[PDB]
């Protein structure tokens, strides 16, 4: 039988005889579009990093916010369908704040990641017998870089399908497959913070169409002491020229 994918494709709630339903597997293909992202974790500091897809020379590129704050000790990224993000994160923070009421403490990081993943699952029944709120499972594949006392510095990969993972060095989006092999072979368990910011500003170079500058990229780094901050342009340009001064020698 050859008409297994041709007909069982479009309705969400149709098992195909191979066991699988497709309209979720296509949602996974969405975030393969968009602009890439990286997350590296450390005993000393978590770090992210993105491109920006310079589209026109007159836009004000502080606006498209592939990276956000979500709480004082958590921060996100996303390499997917845009508008379906701002329906996500205005829930995800809302738990962390709500949690600061019902329990008066900086929430853990995974529980937040479990509240999201119990939201995209609303093309169906959620955990507590809920019914439905949508029919368009959406591509906003996240990276939740955070800190909490039990287990230190973490990141995750939260996908629409619900299931997630505690990756240590991830890279999602269009430049993944060329990267996630490159980060496969250059992740010790004993790196620094700044032995990573330069790294993630080397893979990003080779993988992206244009050349690398401050304008077409940025990054962030939380810390248990300072918090989520999105670095500055002239600060980033410090690291870029620093790299070249390391390459030639």
């Amino acid at each position: 039988m050859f008409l297994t994918r041709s007909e069982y494709d479009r309705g969400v709630s149709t098992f195909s005889p191979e066991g699988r339903l497709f309209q979720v597997e296509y949602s996974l293909e969405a975030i393969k579009l968009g602009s890439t992202a990286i997350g590296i974790a450390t005993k000393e500091g978590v770090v992210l990093g993105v491109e920006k897809r310079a589209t026109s020379p007159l836009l004000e590129s502080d606006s498209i916010e592939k990276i956000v704050e979500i709480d004082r000790h958590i921060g996100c990224a996303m390499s997917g369908l845009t508008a379906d993000a701002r329906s996500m994160i205005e829930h995800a923070r809302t738990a962390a704040v709500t949690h600061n009421l019902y329990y008066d403490e900086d929430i853990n990081v995974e529980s937040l990641t479990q509240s999201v993943c119990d939201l995209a699952l609303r093309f169906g029944e959620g955990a507590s017998g809920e019914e439905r709120l949508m029919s368009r499972p959406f591509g906003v594949a996240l990276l939740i870089a955070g800190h909490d006392a039990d287990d230190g510095y973490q990141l995750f990969h939260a996908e629409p399908s619900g299931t997630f993972y505690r990756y240590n060095a991830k890279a999602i989006g269009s430049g993944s497959e060329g990267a996630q092999a490159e980060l496969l072979n250059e992740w010790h368990s004993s790196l620094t913070l700044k032995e990573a910011e330069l790294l993630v500003l080397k893979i990003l170079k080779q993988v992206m169409e244009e050349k690398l500058d401050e304008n077409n990229a940025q990054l962030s780094c939380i810390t248990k002491q300072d918090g989520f901050k999105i670095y500055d342009n002239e600060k980033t340009a410090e690291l870029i020229k620093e790299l070249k001064e390391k390459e030639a020698a």
């Binding site: 494709d9 479009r10 309705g11 969400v12 497709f22 309209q23 296509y26 949602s27 293909e29 969405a30 975030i31 393969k32 579009l33 026109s56 020379p57 007159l58 836009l59 004000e60 502080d62 606006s63 498209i64 369908l81 845009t82 508008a83 701002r86 329906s87 949508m134 029919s135 368009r136 591509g139």
Partner: protein, 241 residues
Amino acid sequence: SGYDRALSIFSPDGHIFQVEYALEAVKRGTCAVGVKGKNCVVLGCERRSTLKLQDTRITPSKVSKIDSHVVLSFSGLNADSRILIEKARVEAQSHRLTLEDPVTVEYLTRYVAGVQQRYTQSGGVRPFGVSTLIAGFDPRDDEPKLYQTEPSGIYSSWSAQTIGRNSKTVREFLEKNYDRKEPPATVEECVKLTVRSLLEVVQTGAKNIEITVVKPDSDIVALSSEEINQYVTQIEQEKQE
């Protein structure tokens, strides 16, 4: 194909289509434009007057005002235009009630957008074939601001934009004539940058233009047709060549 009917369902690529098909409907509609300097923000729109019986004192003016310190333009189709405004200005006015400080513009555009990203969620509802441009300052601040909405439910900040018909001519015209790190610094200059941005596509008419500007102190004004003919004709001297 089959995947190009509804909103709920995806391609085997990732593309969701209907939203992409609305934006084709934008481009079956008249232009618009928005420029900002430092002490001014402006807006333009090529209208028509192609009929004589039609009374002209209530001319079809793309512009609408949400509050004193805010204006709007649109594109696409106008049966929907009247809606978003009629919910937008409601929301600005149900804000200062609830807060007695008027809208940070970034609060407004996240409600014109928000009404588009609910009408792209569920089948049984249609999107808006529309695409806006905002222009207005905050209260007690000088920084001139401008966004655009879009039926995908997204929005971005722009120093200069042109949407509607033949925009793919006007943008690159504005990629030269502008420079982010030295804007126009006078309320005349943005207009001249703005008028000759229309003159590429507008059969050298001058009755076929509307300009409306905005400034602090809750200021807005529409300009005079005779105040354009001298902002028009003096350019033509400058291409006597």
